[PDB]
Design a protein around this ligand. Structure first.
Ligand code: FE2
Ligand code: ZN
Length: 347
């Protein structure tokens, strides 16, 4: 009983090319793709006005294929879970910072979260690291002035995810830029022959935020992109897999993993409790998170019997199944926070 998971690097708005390759493979090899995982740079632009939030050089200010899927004239043939990179419709991803479907079969994991599917636990970390913005809060609603800073990974995601490895093991973890120092743990002399530019950065290459998360959350696999190249490294058990950009046939690999039980996409219980217990830090919708609160010790108020009754209210008001919701992304922002607040205020 085996599931075939398609892992994809940078998409850069070339969705039809990606699904064309995925559809070719499963009818090539006869294998069936369970779901697809993307490592960011999705460019989920709905309409021309969203081009303002895409931080790219002028030669890449393009719509891409996503608007066809948002308009419904194209349909993603596989369930696609993805995180955010640096070339994103940052306004859209800020509305869905708690996750959400940008269209049918395309689920955004949020700023960071953990999900359940087919007995696996999958963690995502969006954005790329820039030191001068790691402690900077988000401002809502999204403004065109924040195009340069919205896609930067915030430091607080380290404390939002640190406890996820306590109850069980993390199977797959996602980041866009590489975990800092992971370049030192594979065939780097061959990688430097691909790009001698990476030799300048050396061991300091990558995100230090993802390095802390990688060493803490223990995962079996860590898949990243951003670098537009293939690379595999090993640090402890973690099979590090870097993928390239769509258009080059080094972007899509496949994880042939054991299938415990075919199970629908669901919210991770431990993450749901972390999300509720941290609501005081996110209570101000205009600016979050309020780092005057301690995210690490807000989570210390979790107990076994309190966790199990957060789940009941979540299953009542939201549901354990992650289902498609076609409401506008600004409405989904208010709705998800509305029930997060309601669940918290009932404990
Ligand atoms: Fe990137
Ligand atoms: Zn890229």
């Amino acid at each position: 009983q085996i599931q075939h998971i398609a892992i994809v690097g940078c998409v850069h708005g070339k969705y039809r090319e990606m699904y064309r390759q995925l559809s070719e493979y499963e009818k090539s090899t006869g294998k069936e793709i369970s779901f697809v995982i993307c490592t960011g740079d999705m460019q989920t632009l709905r309409y021309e006005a969203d081009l303002v939030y895409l931080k790219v050089p002028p030669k890449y200010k393009q719509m891409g294929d996503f608007h066809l899927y948002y308009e419904g004239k194209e349909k993603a043939p596989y369930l696609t879970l993805f995180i955010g990179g640096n070339a994103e419709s940052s306004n859209v991803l800020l509305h869905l910072y708690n996750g959400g479907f940008v269209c049918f079969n395309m689920y955004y994991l949020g700023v960071c979260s953990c999900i359940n599917i087919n007995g696996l636990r999958i963690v995502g970390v969006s954005g790329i690291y820039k030191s001068f913005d790691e402690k900077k809060p988000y401002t809502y609603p999204p403004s065109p002035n924040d195009v340069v800073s919205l896609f930067h990974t915030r430091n607080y995601v380290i404390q939002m995810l640190s406890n996820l490895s306590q109850s069980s093991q993390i199977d797959i973890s996602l980041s866009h830029d590489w975990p800092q120092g992971i370049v030192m743990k594979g065939n780097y002399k061959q990688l430097y022959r691909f790009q001698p530019g990476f030799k300048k950065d050396g061991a300091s290459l990558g995100s230090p935020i993802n390095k802390v998360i990688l060493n803490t959350l223990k995962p079996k696999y860590w898949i990243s992109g951003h670098m537009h190249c293939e690379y595999h490294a090993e640090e402890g058990p973690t099979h590090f897999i870097a993928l390239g950009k769509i258009g080059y046939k080094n972007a899509i690999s496949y994880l042939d993993l054991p299938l415990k039980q075919k199970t629908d996409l669901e919210y991770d219980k431990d993450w749901v409790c972390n999300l509720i217990m941290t609501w005081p830090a996110f209570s101000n919708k205009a600016q979050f998170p309020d780092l005057s609160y301690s995210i690490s010790e807000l989570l210390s108020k979790r107990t076994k019997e309190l966790d199990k009754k957060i789940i009941e209210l979540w299953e009542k008001y939201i549901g354990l199944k992650i289902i498609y919701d076609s409401d506008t992304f600004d409405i989904q922002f208010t709705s998800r926070r509305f029930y997060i607040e309601k669940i918290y205020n009932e404990l």
